[PDB]
Subunit: 448 residues, 2 copies
Amino acid sequence: MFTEIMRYVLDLGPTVMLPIVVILFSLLLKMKPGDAFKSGIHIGIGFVGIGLVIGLMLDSIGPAAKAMAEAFDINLKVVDIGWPGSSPMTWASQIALIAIPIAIVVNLVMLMTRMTRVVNVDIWNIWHMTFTGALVHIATGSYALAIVGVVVHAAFVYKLGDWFAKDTRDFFGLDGIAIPHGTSAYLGPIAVLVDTVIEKIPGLNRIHFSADDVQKRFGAFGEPVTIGFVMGLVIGLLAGYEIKAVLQLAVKTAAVMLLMPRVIKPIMDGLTPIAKQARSRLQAKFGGQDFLIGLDPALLLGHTSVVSASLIFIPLTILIAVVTPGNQVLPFGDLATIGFFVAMAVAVHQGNLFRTLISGVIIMSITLWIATQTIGLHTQLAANAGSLTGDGSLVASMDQGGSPITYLLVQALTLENVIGLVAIGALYGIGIFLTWRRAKRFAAQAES
Amino acid sequence: MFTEIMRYVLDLGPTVMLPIVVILFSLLLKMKPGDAFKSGIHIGIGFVGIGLVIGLMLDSIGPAAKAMAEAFDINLKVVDIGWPGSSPMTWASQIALIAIPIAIVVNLVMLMTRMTRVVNVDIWNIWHMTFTGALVHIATGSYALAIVGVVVHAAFVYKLGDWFAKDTRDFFGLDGIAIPHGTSAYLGPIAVLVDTVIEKIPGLNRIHFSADDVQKRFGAFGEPVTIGFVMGLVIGLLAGYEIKAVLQLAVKTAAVMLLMPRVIKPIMDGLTPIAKQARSRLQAKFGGQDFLIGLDPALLLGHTSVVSASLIFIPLTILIAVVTPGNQVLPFGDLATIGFFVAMAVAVHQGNLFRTLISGVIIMSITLWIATQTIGLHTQLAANAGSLTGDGSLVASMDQGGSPITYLLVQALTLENVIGLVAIGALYGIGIFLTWRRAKRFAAQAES
């Protein structure tokens, strides 16, 4: 019974199921049915528009970035299929369906114990937890260890959405919204560690370069739209595109950056009365701070600095992949939405594109090395899901193949690479401790 | 050379070429290059967003409406390919490329003689004039007569955009923008005639029903978004779609209605400083009223009443096609954007949905009868363009096959159907005279 119900709910999508969940929550909050329905349909509309602009990204910058990647003479044989290739592969796994109830049960358990405030409703990003569990299952060979990996990933991402709540509220303006999923949430700790290290270092901490600085320096050509147009021009030129294709891609990138906030605005409009009623009634009933709603990481693309970093980092990601030692993954499928990796890095640095560039370089290097490490597990995952081609080419990805959580869990439960496990674990544990202390300090400051 | 450059500009398309023309106009107005470029890229972004939402319409309500057309047991063998099928067919015509310089020369000649104020820049809708000329060429067999038809259609549509300038400025809020192209512009005279007849008739003129009336009647459920959601539900239910498909389509239609104005807003934001500079300098230099910029009829989809009529008229269009005497065309491809037919009908009636419904029924009946009349010419056009299938099935369309201009010109130059020509010519000439007198009266009132 459970299987087809979960499949139906997943197939409904964020467009339909998420408004249904929001309407149910609003009705449970004793709101008028008209307002509840209006908020629900507004959230559905916002997610439809998000899908439209994300498809525009994947269909315009996607092929352009891939053409740029192949254009440069490279020795990276394995291609990064990205989340467009990882997510269908992950949803075809054995534990794919049970991951949704496992993640929801974990979220509920941590909510009742007041270990988190993130009420995750975006169940279509539980394919990340599913990916972690599937790779653990492939490596160790134990179903119980796969479930343990799913539970650990879910708890970690909920706590990350809790810790980066201040950044989404202040920098991104998504008040009452957490972003626990995506690469941004679990690559944020690396950004926090880099920011702390830079602040410790004299001289480098003084270097500041925000998008507002670009605007003030370049006048009317420093607007976010002009930056997106110029970045699209650069991408098209590097990709070997013709002048017509270059200009069309440039206008499409500028349109992406102008239209992400516009299509994300309906979600905020729908959720604002819901959040107000929640903080009025449920927060008072249960005490503590207001509960956050966990949503898609595509909301982070509303910020213009995030889209600017997304456009800038495509050539930077390819250059990093060439530079990074012991890397065999060529970033192919994740290049279209490479801003997901550095979305939280921008927020941590308050939009400082210098610090953002440093953190993004570190993050991309780490993710590419981790993807190189998990090439074998990802190929086995493709073979299990049936997506492996006849030639048996190696499969690797950066959205989830390069996730530090998955690699750390696999190494901890297998110990196949002691030195790499120690290094990545030390770096990520320091990042986690730093981001937890940072969130605790921000909460203390807000309370005072 | 000329063919190559014309094809290159057409392939550049509204996304790129229109910003280039706008930037050139702004530079000719002695504006700063930064503001000129910002306006141009904003217009390009607006047109990218318009294309995104139009693609959403054609990919969600398109197949749903086609499934509705199949679902009802009908005897209309010939299917309406619509403008998605007519425009590629038209651009493959012999006169397709020369139509652009012919239309631009006609526009310039009428501008210098002060016969119009519409500066048409949307050259990708010159395929309407091309369609008229191609059908005239097929019927009469004379190249000169085809050129005459193209010239007549171009002059007529520029004058229509001039006459419906008040409706675009006031009802749609597109100040300083004319909409001379599309089915809305040349089906507006029928709406004007219907409105005049209704106003003459006592009792019926007192009946008023607007979207605001629905909003006041219902509440949060009278919101335009709720109307779009309900209409999507109805379309999905009638199409035989499953509940998941029904709900996804409903949210997509509501998203269309909420997102069309948002993606149209960049065009207005970009064009406002240009219009201000134009009315400041060029209008004073050349006297008269401010010149209007002719753009895509998709700008008329920003209004929520227009999208509501678009959604409502799909089942109405199918019912009319069944009812209409001597009709053999089943509305298939134009159903997704059937609001283009009544976009100006809404504006003429000040959003009165009862009057809009009457005008739309009359307009759809007329267009379906005309498409039935021009089935043969459209089939010959398909054979000429090579798009005709092997079985030689009849081809007809409603976007341009059913245009009263094309049918009137063909009948005037061929005298194939004397009675039908007389009837349609009398009706359309009365509509043209009424809309010209209406525009003249509005201009006189504004002057006073």
